[PDB]
Design a protein around this ligand. Structure first.
Ligand SMILES: COc1cc(-c2cnc3nc2NCCCNS(=O)(=O)c2cccc(c2)N3)ccc1F
Length: 272
């Protein structure tokens, strides 16, 4: 990582909460996000996250500018993502994008995840809340926090693959499951997966073969792809490489997206 002198950084506005700030970096000044920090474990985890981010260089992975580690409080300095977290963004912008735009967002996320997976990094916590959006609608994987544990052991059950829940096997294939959930988040403009089902209701439903119902006006090819991400058997799930390839083909032949999946029976029963 680049060590950045504090005189080069001004914090302006809290954007998350240590806390995260929007600010300016002057190594001619550029907007940045600034996260501030503690025990030895906290320090190792905080600088650990920076070290992980600094090891990556990919369009769809949040870019680290540098750290303040020689002075306290310690800080992480990243690019500033103008549109914030994807979950909140989608819920505030319901209906405002084309299908092609939404699919493009998913391709970007898939490309980032392919890169992580190929770099032997298993995310464990892939969700719309952990993706950020810039002013070109580029989606970047954006949370590399290290002290993470499964809900009801931080990481929510209903985004997690069955094998990760059942016997703690987190792999890139369990991240693909999570990506399937993100697909459904994006195509629904940030609906909560499984709505008010309890954690144990979700797990029972999944184990009995149920999956999330078709989003409204969702392209058939997109629903087919998210369903394959949710195969019980990991070896039947697509790899990120496959997902990128498929999404690219759909984007380059956009008429392919005009064919819509039909209404789920669980949706029919709730309409008057
Ligand atoms: C400095 O360290 C990091 C910062 C970010 C980050 C970059 N950029 C923005 N927010 C970030 N985090 C807070 C997200 C939650 N608030 S939000 O959705 O309300 C929001 C709103 C507007 C912009 C924005 C966030 N932009 C990501 C990873 C990091 F390690």
């Amino acid at each position: 990582t680049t060590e950045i002198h504090p005189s080069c950084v001004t914090r302006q506005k809290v954007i998350g909460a240590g806390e995260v700030y929007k600010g300016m970096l002057k190594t001619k000044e550029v907007p940045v996000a600034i996260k501030t920090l503690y025990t030895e474990k906290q320090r190792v985890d905080f600088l650990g996250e920076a070290g992980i981010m600094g090891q990556f260089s990919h369009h769809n992975i949040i870019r680290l500018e540098g750290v303040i580690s020689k002075y306290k409080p310690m800080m992480i300095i990243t690019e500033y993502m103008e549109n914030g977290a994807l979950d909140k963004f989608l819920r505030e912008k319901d209906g405002e994008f084309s299908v092609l735009q939404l699919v493009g967002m998913l391709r970007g996320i898939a490309a980032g995840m392919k890169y992580l997976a190929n770099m032997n990094y298993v995310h464990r916590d892939l969700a719309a809340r952990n993706i950020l959006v810039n002013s070109n609608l580029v989606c970047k994987v954006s949370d590399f926090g290290l002290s993470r544990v499964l809900e009801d052991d931080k990481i929510p059950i209903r985004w997690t693959a069955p094998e990760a829940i059942s016997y703690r096997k987190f792999t890139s294939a369990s991240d693909v499951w999570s990506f399937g959930i993100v697909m459904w988040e994006v195509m629904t403009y940030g609906e909560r997966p499984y709505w008010e089902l309890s954690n144990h209701e979700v797990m029972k439903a999944i184990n009995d073969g149920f999956r999330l119902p078709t989003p409204m006006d969702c392209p058939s090819a997109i629903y087919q792809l998210m369903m394959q991400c949710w195969q019980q058997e990991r070896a039947r799930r697509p790899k990120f490489a496959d997902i990128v390839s498929i999404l690219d083909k759909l984007i380059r032949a956009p008429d392919s997206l005009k064919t819509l999946a039909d209404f789920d029976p669980r949706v029919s029963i709730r309409l008057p």
